[PDB]
Amino acid sequence: MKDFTTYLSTAPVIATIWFTFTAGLLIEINRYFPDPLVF
Amino acid sequence: LYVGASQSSLAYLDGSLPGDFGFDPLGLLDPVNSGGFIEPKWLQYSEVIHARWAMLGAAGCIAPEVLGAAGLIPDATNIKWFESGVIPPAGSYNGYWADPYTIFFVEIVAMQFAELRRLQDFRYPGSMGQQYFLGLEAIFKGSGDAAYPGGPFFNLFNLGKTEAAMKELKLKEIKNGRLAMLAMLGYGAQAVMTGKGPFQNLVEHLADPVNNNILTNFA
Amino acid sequence: VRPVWFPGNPPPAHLDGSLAGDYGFDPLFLGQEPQTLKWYVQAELVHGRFAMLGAAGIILTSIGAKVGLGFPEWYDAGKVVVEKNNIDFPTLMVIQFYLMGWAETKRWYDFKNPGSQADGSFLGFTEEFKGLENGYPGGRFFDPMGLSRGDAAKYQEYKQKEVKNGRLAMIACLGFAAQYAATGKGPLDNLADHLADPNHVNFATNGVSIPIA
Amino acid sequence: FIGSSTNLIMVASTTATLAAARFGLAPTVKKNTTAGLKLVDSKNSAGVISNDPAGFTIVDVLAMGAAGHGLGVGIVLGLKGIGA
Amino acid sequence: KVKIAVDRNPVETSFEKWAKPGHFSRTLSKGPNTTTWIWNLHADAHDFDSHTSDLEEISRKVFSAHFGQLGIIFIWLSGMYFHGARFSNYEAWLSDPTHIKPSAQVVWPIVGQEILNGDVGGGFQGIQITSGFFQLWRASGITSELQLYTTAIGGLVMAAAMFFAGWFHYHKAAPKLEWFQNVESMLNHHLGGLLGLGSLAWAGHQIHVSLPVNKLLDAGVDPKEIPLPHDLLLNRAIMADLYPSFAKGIAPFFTLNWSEYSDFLTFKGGLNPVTGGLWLSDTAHHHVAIAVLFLVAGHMYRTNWGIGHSM
Amino acid sequence: DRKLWAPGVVAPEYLKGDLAGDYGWDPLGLGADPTALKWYRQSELQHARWAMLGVAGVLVQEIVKPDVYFYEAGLPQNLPEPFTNINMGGLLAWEFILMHWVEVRRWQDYKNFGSVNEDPIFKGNKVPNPEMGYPGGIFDPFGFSKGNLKELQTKEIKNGRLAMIAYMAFILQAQATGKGPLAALSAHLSNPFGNNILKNIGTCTVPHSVDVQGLTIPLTCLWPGSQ
């Protein structure tokens, strides 16, 4: 389990998780606030 | 002994196991570099399990038809084995206390306890005689052999008192099981060909063996 | 020696029979790391204790609905209370997060720092918030009758009953959701139907649990 | 079908193959042909035992049976195809 | 002696190596000091020969890597069958194949991308596919999204089996080098079993399902009223009506009266005028012949008996 | 040593012949645990004595009142005067209260032998209670224990085991035939081949439910037969 969590802490895994989180956040924002051109 | 014997098989087939008639053309019981399910212990145990289920099936699939002919059971029962409900497409009996999926659940829960407890004794010999199981664990100690647990219930009448007598009975169990496993293949092959019952097939082959056989059935 | 979940299979090493309800069940080794195991212990107890209140709430209100006492089904109670009593959903929800937030954060920091909530910081209360064990905060507020501070053996037996009754309630709440989703009726309506026809009214004949049936 | 042209052809074909191997007029599990199309002692691995005097094992029968079947099928369908 | 030979519990199943990048290499296991290490790790990941000089270990890695590939391909196929059952216009296209465009990919409505859901027809909006799956499924005789969904579930069960096989044949029962070096046995099974049996089995599906279903489709019968494949497999009278020779059963096969099966085993050539594709009766007689040819070919190499050839 | 349940069987080590009616018969090994054997022996004594009273009740009642069916005597409308149509609830009240006392007294004797062997009211009144399950004294008002108790314990357990099988015969015969145990014998003797389990089995002659003074009590047979 400790080794498994270390594997989940590897650069590629963290990147996939972090980028999936960031992409999701941006998508959801555009899903609830569509066509945002200006502040 | 039996046709197909090979010098290669004579290496491991020394006649200790029940039904060793020297027949291993594909070299499956060779202990050298063995592993997975291709190993003597699992394969002998599997032949006996298949054999015991096949002996009960060869009788269960041919019993209702015979008894129905003898008039000992109502015609309502007396149904063909493939028409019992195991394969609804081929037919199903609507006179059970519950529907088949309800009875099948009862089967799942029952078999899982029976099979997984039998498995644990093969994996950890003597384990099923330790943890409490309503006092039944007293009869599940088993022996060092998985296919022959024996004990107060599995060997109720203590038959096979001597090593020789038990060896003979083990030879008779494997012989009758191997025959029944072949009968069960016949029952399935003859149900696809004629679409009739195993008993009916025998009755026709006696009523007229020439016009009632596989070569005639092809047409 | 201790009864295990799959008879014949040795218990995992991180499970030594010390914890209440230890039947050596951790097939995915999720509690292999100790500190993680302590967290999951409080998690199972917190989930289980809520499920026990939930199950007892659904069963009583379901009995009152089975009889003619006008108690709404569990899946309809939320709307009845708000509508009949003109209660503002947003206000009730935020009030809950305020109260639960305070109690949960104090329980959280006790886990992070055991005994740290008994300094008198909260209205001068000290001993009622020290905590006896992980997931077992005795004292005079949470154990008002002293059952944990009297007869050590009785305390151990009570802990076994609590975890087992909590795991049963957690299974029962999953059953109340699955049965409502599959049948659309209440839990005691499902029990009456089964009792009436146990061989023809069950999951195998609900038309949903087994799709090929 | 019994005694029919097809039946006779099939029976004779399989019989001829079995006989050829049985009398060393064909390759066997213990007799293998050389590049010069000969017949020398082969070295079967499984080494199935045969009480048969010429050591004709069941594998030899299986092989001859297949060869003979193929021969019979080809002859029957071939004659049918050539009208004969 | 050709035989099954394996080593038991050769490699432990732990995540210890998962947390040690470059464990497979003597140079890479030391860890990274420059960015070149990252590239080297990925570039030398599947070069087993460079990992170890043991052929048996390399062979065991290759075998399990192939089971991993087979599992990947199965997931891919299950997705295609699933998207055909849940995100496609196949059922409408079955009724009107000359006008409705095949589509099996629907996009979510976000950032304006829903424009990609074109008006493909059949009351459906999605991306037009060109993989040819709709025509393959029609040839196979699939007429419902239920059949596509069931095959998708089957493919995932097969993918799980492939990944299991990969783990089992590397960590539990790893075949020894002698096993892999049985080229004569491998060719006999791949020609006779994989190819010949595969072709024979496919002929079975085509004769009992593809030919009657497609004959009814070409006759103009609505896909809803066509008999289900099992109805055709369990009833000979229906198949006999569509193909008179089925009334004779398999007698003609064992009596060498093959000419009787001329109505489903044909040599027409050319193209079916209704669909523009090859005749399925021609594809059926073809796969039956392929099966026979490859069954013979798989009995050429010597194994555990004297008969056969030595490469 | 002693006679066993079968020729060639070896008695379990825990069955050495101490308890009466010991044929070394424990196929499922439920007596291997001493605590369990003690409870199961009490349970066997309870089922034996109750079943012997039941066999005798069904037979005596059948002879005295051959018109009343034992399987349906519990129905209040079939109660003898002046108990006909008596409030069944009130009747269960007496049985629950009385049985609960006697059953908890006997139970406490199991938990602590010789702990409840005295009249809780009129002190001095005490039962000998030589062995658990055998109180004696007021319970043995004729002194038959003062003799060969072990041989009498054998007759009790043997007659009890036979009565337990018989009672279940009466029940199953009642369910398949609809008649009591002497009426069934007569029907058999009337036409042995005509009336027998071969034909009787396959039919449950018991309704699915009965209304007792306003309450529906669900009823079931011991096998899925035509009901």
Ligand code: CLA
């Ligand atoms: C390229 C594929 C492939 C190959 C070459 C092998 C090869 C081998 N396997 Mg293996 N295996 C595979 C795939 C493969 N496997 C898959 C996908 C699984 C997961 C289901 C397994 C699970 C598995 C287990 C659990 C075991 C093996 C074992 C073995 C070894 C000897 C057993 C044997 O195969 O005898 C021949 C196989 C049999 C006698 C059993 C036949 C049962 C099959 C399922 C019946 C039908 C097979 C046929 C292809 C089905 C066609 C379709 C059907 C509708 C007719 C052998 C080296 C055994 C071993 O380790 O020995 C040391 C062993 O224990 N395999």
Ligand code: CLA
């Ligand atoms: C939980 C199950 C499990 C566990 C704990 C292990 C553990 C281990 N395995 Mg292993 N293995 C498994 C399942 C498992 N395996 C299965 C199912 C297979 C069949 C494919 C294999 C086949 C296998 C081989 C052939 C080898 C190992 C090896 C090893 C050891 C080191 C390699 C390693 O794991 O690093 C971790 C490696 C990875 C995380 C890479 C993942 C590979 C996946 C399948 C590729 C997926 C790519 C994706 C589909 C497409 C990407 C496209 C892109 C655009 C995103 C290690 C102790 C190696 C060894 O023995 O040590 C030298 C060895 O050579 N395994």
Ligand code: CLA
């Ligand atoms: C009838 C026998 C048979 C069959 C059908 C196969 C089939 C296959 N073998 Mg193979 N093989 C066999 C015998 C057989 N083998 C024998 C006897 C040996 C020892 C000499 C080998 C040694 C061998 C090696 C070294 C390799 C293969 C590989 C393969 C796969 C190549 C991928 C492909 O093109 O097919 C397409 C794929 C499919 C059609 C999917 C269907 C596959 C199912 C599971 C059919 C079952 C095959 C299996 C042998 C049946 C037994 C399983 C049982 C043990 C549980 C393929 C599925 C390659 C591989 O890695 O596969 C993982 C490979 O490297 N085989």
Ligand code: CLA
């Ligand atoms: C893989 C290829 C394949 C398969 C699977 C089938 C399968 C089938 N064909 Mg077919 N066929 C094929 C290729 C194939 N065919 C080819 C290539 C041709 C061209 C020559 C034909 C031409 C053809 C014709 C003309 C006909 C068939 C027919 C049939 C059906 C009946 C078979 C029969 O009569 O008895 C065959 C005997 C058996 C299948 C043996 C059965 C053994 C059983 C399954 C074993 C069970 C054992 C087990 C232990 C039992 C216990 C069960 C458990 C619950 C306890 C059958 C479903 C007939 C039909 O359509 O019927 C309507 C028919 O008329 N076929």
Ligand SMILES: CC1=C[C@H](O)CC(C)(C)[C@H]1/C=C/C(C)=C/C=C/C(C)=C/C=C/C=C(C)/C=C/C=C(C)/C=C/C1=C(C)C[C@H](O)CC1(C)C
């Ligand atoms: C030896 C050898 C050697 C070499 O080396 C190789 C080889 C050759 C491979 C090997 C082998 C061979 C063989 C032959 C095998 C076979 C098997 C079988 C047949 C089985 C069966 C098997 C069979 C079986 C189990 C059966 C079973 C059955 C049962 C239980 C039951 C059933 C039933 C009944 C009653 C009735 C109903 O109504 C229905 C049912 C439900 C259905």
Ligand SMILES: CC1=C(/C=C/C(C)=C/C=C/C(C)=C/C=C/C=C(C)/C=C/C=C(C)/C=C/C2=C(C)CCCC2(C)C)C(C)(C)CCC1
């Ligand atoms: C003299 C003698 C003997 C006898 C023996 C015998 C009797 C033998 C024979 C045997 C036999 C009787 C054999 C045969 C076999 C056959 C087979 C084995 C066949 C097979 C078939 C096949 C393989 C086919 C194939 C195919 C198809 C299916 C399709 C198309 C065509 C073809 C051909 C390709 C004895 C013992 C008495 C001893 C003493 C002396």
Ligand SMILES: CCCCCCCCCCCCO[C@@H]1O[C@H](CO)[C@@H](O[C@H]2O[C@H](CO)[C@@H](O)[C@H](O)[C@H]2O)[C@H](O)[C@H]1O
């Ligand atoms: C050789 C083994 C490997 C291939 C196995 C193929 C079969 C697998 C089992 C499922 C199919 C069973 O085979 C099934 O047999 C019945 C027998 O009544 C056939 O039934 C057919 O022949 C019977 C006579 O025998 C006719 O009365 C019936 O009208 C006709 O449809 C089904 O059409 C066929 O589908």
